[PDB]
A paper describes a structure:
The bacteriophage T7, Escherichia coli podophage, has been employed as a model for the investigation of the DNA packaging and delivery mechanism among tailed phages and related dsDNA viruses. The tail, connected to a unique vertex of the head by the dodecameric portal gp8, consists of the dodecameric adaptor protein gp11 and the hexameric nozzle protein gp12 (20, 24) surrounded by six trimeric tail fibers gp17 (16, 22, 24). The core is formed by the core proteins gp14, gp15, and gp16; upon virion adsorption onto host membranes or the receptor rough lipopolysaccharide (LPS), these core proteins have been suggested to extend the tail channel and form a trans-envelope channel for genome delivery into the infected cell. In this study, using a 300 kV cryo-electron microscopy (cryo-EM) and defocus refinement with Z-height correction, we provided improved structures of core proteins at a resolution of 3 Å, the portal–tail complex in mature T7 at a resolution of 2.7 Å, and the portal–tail complex in LPS-induced DNA-ejected T7 at a resolution of 3.5 Å.
Through the local reconstruction method and by independently refining the Z-height for different regions, we obtained the structures of the core complex, portal, and portal–tail complex in mature T7 at resolutions of 3, 2.5, and 2.7 Å, respectively. Notably, we identified eight copies of the core protein gp14 and 12 copies of the small protein gp6.7 between the portal barrel and the core, as well as six copies of the small protein gp7.3 at the junction of the adaptor and tail nozzle within the tail channel, which served to anchor the end of the dsDNA. Twelve copies of the gp6.7 loop I, which surrounds the outer surface of the dodecameric portal helical barrel, mediate the interaction between the portal barrel and gp14. We modeled the C-terminal loop (residues 84–98) of 99-residue gp7.3. Six copies of the C-terminal loop, with each copy being anchored to two adjacent nozzle proteins of gp12, are located at the junction of the nozzle and adaptor in the tail channel. Twelve lysine residues (residues K84 and K85) derived from the six copies of gp7.3 interact with the dsDNA end in the portal–tail channel. On the basis of the location of the C-terminus in the resolved structure of gp7.3, the unstructured densities encircling dsDNA can be attributed to the unresolved N-terminus (residues 1–83) in gp7.3. Thus, all gp7.3 molecules interact with both the tail and the DNA end within the portal–tail channel. Our structure revealed that six copies of gp7.3 are located at the junction of the adaptor and nozzle within the tail channel, suggesting that gp7.3 might serve as a structural scaffold to assist the assembly of the nozzle into the adaptor. Additionally, in the tip domain of the mature T7 nozzle, each gp12 molecule contains a three-stranded β-sheet (residues 264–294) with two long hairpins: A (residues 264–282) and B (residues 283–294).
Numbering used by the authors:
A (entry chain U), I (entry chain h): 1 to 196
B (entry chain R): 696 to 794
C (entry chain 1), M (entry chain z), O (entry chain y): 84 to 98
D (entry chain q), H (entry chain r): 294 to 342
E (entry chain R), N (entry chain S): 2 to 50
F (entry chain b): 5 to 138
G (entry chain Z): 2 to 196
J (entry chain a): 3 to 143
Write the structure that this text describes.
């Protein structure tokens, strides 16, 4: 699992943590560097947890289709990193699983590949790289989970539940606007049926 | 209140300017050891070449029946300890009223 | 939550 | 005549999965999450007709 | 139901009564400990040769 | 003293000694060496009868195709047993385990001679009947 | 913090810290020493939940056509404790566990001349699970940790909601991974489609 | 004309069991968990027709 | 009734007891050997009781059909052990009962058999021999009954009630997947009706 | 057995992005070399780029036409220069302790993964030269 | 480098140590003759300074042992720094704790290179030794 | 809106104040990768000419209706 | 709103 | 839930006990201050040369 | 109607 504590703090990540801290009424911190602030460390841990979780759900902007994963020429092993939030086949049933930290073809029962494999993959991205709407949803969901675990205020629970629902709705609006999906000519099956 | 059953969940020790001390939790079957070594990471007090004294609360799990949990503090080091107070939380239930 | 036993310091002798 | 698929953003059905599916595919989602914009002028349509 | 009690001061020394009869501030054993009025339980002062 | 050692396989025996110290059971790797190499799984193929011995659930030998078993210590480098968290009491046990775990990897680093060609009594380079590729 | 580092953390220690965080407790730096009840309790539940979710059966972890070879002398196939599910490849299953060995109930025999072919679920590590499944395991492990070792009922309402969302996202992963089709992927209907 | 089977992810029915099943097979599941995407344009269809 | 506490402890039975102990918040025990731990002894007794109960219900994996029970050649008695959770006929109405610990033919009013009888029998098996899903249900049901009897926590009661229902559902899924039942060609009556 | 610090990929002449599976503390610890007739080391900002912290993007596509069959991504952690040095007056921090532990861990890993710079057994039962010449073998008999 | 040699026929005792050693038990001194001789510390060599060893006796090529090898063998099992709770954490002890593992790693980088290594040209430089028992 | 790349690096900065960045029509193809506009379909950060996008750029509270 | 701890001045000695 | 407490008089001086053992009217530090009976905490009277 | 502050005459000195 990618470390969230070990790199430079960005403005958005610092802003996200202070947003999460505000959910239980904690004042903002100037830096994410270790000052023995248990609340800020707890907030950053939940922030990373929610960041991984929403990205792993799968969206048009973060689902990478047709990606080639290359093997090592001398070991023929393709690494299945813990940052691969989702790994699928481009079409049909998926055949690749994680076995010992490497890609494993469950149908052929082999982990050796002579050439790159083409997969539909979700790779972990920085909270910076998330769209503004998705950043708000991550923060809202992290704030709700932070209050549930470390304060537990029921009034804060109800409002953050409503905020998450609004935050997720606006991410769903982003998903369709970004996706631009069509059931007539953008459809895998119907578009063939439209030819005269 | 000994009539009901109290299932201990967690206890804590309050300390101020104290060095390491070991918390031993023993039940009828098993035993556990918890160390309050001193200051925490990132604390202004925790420095190299300086005496490690911690101040605050240390929460440790004391799990099971309260009647069969022995908690004691051991320390044989040259650091000081100042135990201010303690406390515990647990799930309590009695099937009868106090009457 | 069943009621608790009332704290009775009580006493001794004739009552 | 215009077909508009209204996707409920409080729902769980992704047009990403619908459009990429082949006929006969099993896809996560609920029929309630997908609806269609419709002209609701039947009473006015009959008056004009 | 979750319940919680705190012993603010461990200043009662030891008690040889059964635990059901003891005060919250009395323990079972206390060796080489100092029961301060304002600092709680401490190590007894070191013996200086 | 060695973190890697090999025992010859007979159908009679099932218990094999672990001489080295390992921090986690998953750090111990059990492999069957024959014409084909087979890594065994923690519970279906063997177990830890004691802290220092491994008992196989099934006996193996030349009939199965493996004449030797290998017990190798592979301390995890990516997955560290200690990660210091901000605002946590710094315990000497954490520092010792962090120092020990990296030491085990370095200790295994100086046992790579087993997985290398080796040198003869004459001072030549002796491939134990192994092809050289690339 | 200087440098553009790229380092990882152990996922089991992260999982336990998420389980500890669910009940409001501080994270631990290590999971060994055998003297921490919280570490022991959280790890036992996380292993138990990880074992339980894998045993339910998913396209990614149900291994089909796996051959289990018998012993050359005793002709016994060990029924492993780490065999979360063992079934026949088709039809009614015929193999049961009898004293730690594969037993054919129809023929009433523990002995097999050649390897049997079964549909098997073998326990995998928590690290080898998909990210959504790892989240579901942690969410479920946190929920049972609160019920067994914290007991706060308002945390149960929160974690019940989180598990239900955690399970649906894994069900989305199952359907996307399976790619199941009732027209041509169907075992029976695909035959009916031939003209 | 497109057949899309909508599987409730909050449900318990698995298309893994449905697709591998033979005709007449008994399988765990609930009929409410499996639905199908349908075009809801009957009001507009009648107006256009 | 088979003694549950008189044999070596398996890893699974020890794990099962620790799981039951956790349900009320008891810490795990290292061994199942008698250390005067009343809670562990209570947990193991309920574990055995639930183990017998769920097995006696009857499942494709544990219902042994066509088993021959052999009589003693000099007494002509077939023992009806207490480990026979269910004893039935292979077809039609059952005719064998328990009378004095021996199999009794109630229709012929005899307990003497010159040859083995063929019966549909459920024989008690170790908890170690149960499928993983069934082990989970046994532990879940044992944990629920353990909490009800010796702690009685209502919040724990509600969650364990839900867990048993989920655990039984997953055992129901196992039963059908193992069973592979077909009403067309696997049916006793319908299969004959399909011949043209 | 299998090396985790040295990752080498086939060069096809059209792909410029390669994955970094191993951990690293500094981008200088990652060494990019093209292998072929010779082993040419690439420069940090003129020959390639860190597109992401796990991806290296080459400025130019290299292939057999350029004389390079493979590209190698190898971690070389500094041994003489430590990234964290504790002082008597400094606050002990979790980040400093982590970096100190991880750096020694990387150095230990690279020593254990040094079968790349020798002839070691690969996944198969074969001693692997990994695409380099066994020079100075001279006469044979 | 963790391994060095000196061949000195004339009367000489002093050998400068190139590598850094944490303990005197880590440095092992042997005599490379027809068969190697491992020498105890007190009887055979004294540490005149932290940098140099004064090996008692000439031990020259007049005897078969000719050259002398200075090898660093850091003990993996023994840790020079063992952290204890209640003890002042010292920047020195934190620094040395990492170094002992690094020194073991340094020794590993030379043991594997000893039998066969890679030269500055990125090629596997043989010492002029035939590849015997090689399978086709 | 046209976002011009750098003349040398050919990189278009993905601003933190880009509340939404989409294509003018159809499915969007640009994502943020390390603070730079990335074409996911072509897998490239490099643009010879400026891209045309449907962009929401953060405005001041004073500029709101 | 969970109940508060009862303020117990308590005491010492034998009880 | 929102809770609020008021300290009517800051006339208790300072206390060196732990904060959980202190009375609400005792602070941690008080320098050059006067604890009036009817005017609360004041600055101490100026020192007139 | 939110609860009132409990009238605490309280005290001084060591507690």
């Amino acid at each position: 699992m990618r470390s969230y504590d070990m790199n430079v703090e960005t403005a958005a990540e610092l802003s996200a943590v202070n947003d999460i801290l505000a959910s239980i009424g904690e004042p903002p911190v100037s830096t994410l560097e270790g000052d023995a602030n248990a609340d800020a460390a707890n907030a950053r841990r939940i922030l990373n947890k929610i960041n991984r979780q929403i990205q792993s759900r799968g969206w048009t902007f973060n689902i990478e289709e047709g990606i080639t994963l290359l093997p090592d020429v001398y070991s023929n092993l393709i690494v299945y990193s813990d940052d691969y939030l989702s790994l699928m086949s481009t079409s049909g049933q998926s055949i690749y699983v994680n076995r010992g930290g490497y890609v494993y073809d469950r149908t052929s029962q082999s982990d050796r590949f002579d050439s790159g494999i083409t997969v539909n993959i979700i790779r972990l991205r920085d909270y910076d790289e998330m769209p503004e709407c998705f950043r708000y949803w991550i923060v809202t969901k992290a704030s709700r989970q932070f209050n549930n675990r470390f304060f537990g205020a029921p009034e804060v629970e109800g409002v953050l539940q409503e905020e998450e629902d609004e935050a997720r709705r606006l991410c769903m609006e982003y998903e369709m606007d970004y996706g631009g999906y069509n059931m007539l000519d953008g459809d895998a099956f119907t578009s063939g049926l439209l030819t005269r | 209140e000994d009539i009901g059953r109290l299932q201990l969940r967690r206890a804590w020790v309050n300390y101020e300017n104290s060095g390491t001390f070991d918390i031993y939790v023993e039940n009828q079957s098993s035993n556990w050891k918890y160390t309050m070594a001193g200051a925490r990471l990132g604390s202004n007090t925790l420095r190299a070449g300086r005496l490690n004294l911690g101040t605050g609360q240390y929460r440790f799990p004391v799990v099971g029946n309260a009647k069969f949990n022995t908690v004691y503090i051991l320390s044989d080091e040259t650091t000081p300890l100042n135990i201010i107070g303690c406390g515990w939380e647990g799930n309590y239930l009695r099937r009868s009223s106090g009457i | 939550k069943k009621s608790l036993s009332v704290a009775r310091s009580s006493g001794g002798g004739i009552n | 005549s215009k077909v508009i698929g209204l996707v409920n953003p409080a729902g769980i059905t992704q047009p990403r999965r619908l459009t990429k599916a082949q006929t006969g595919d099993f896809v996560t989602g609920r029929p309630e999450d997908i609806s269609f914009l419709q002209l609701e002028k039947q009473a006015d349509f009959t008056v004009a007709k | 139901a979750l319940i919680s009690q705190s012993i603010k001061n461990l200043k009662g020394g030891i008690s040889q009564q059964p635990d059901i009869l003891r005060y919250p501030d009395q323990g079972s054993r206390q060796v080489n400990g100092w029961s301060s009025e304002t600092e709680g339980l401490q190590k007894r002062p070191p013996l200086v040769f | 003293i060695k973190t890697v050692l090999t025992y010859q396989l007979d159908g009679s025996n099932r218990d094999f000694n672990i001489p080295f110290e390992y921090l986690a059971r998953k750090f111990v790797v059990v492999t069957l060496i024959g014409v084909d190499r087979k890594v065994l799984t923690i519970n279906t193929d063997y177990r830890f009868a004691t802290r220092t011995t491994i008992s196989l659930t099934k006996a193996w030998g030349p009939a199965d195709g493996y004449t030797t078993i290998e017990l190798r210590r592979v301390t995890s480098t990516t997955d560290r047993l200690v990660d210091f968290t901000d605002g946590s009491i710094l315990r000497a046990y954490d520092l010792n385990v962090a120092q020990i775990q990296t030491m085990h990897v370095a200790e295994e680093a100086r046992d790579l001679t087993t997985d290398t060609i080796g040198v003869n009594n004459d001072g030549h380079l002796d491939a134990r009947g192994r092809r050289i590729v690339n």
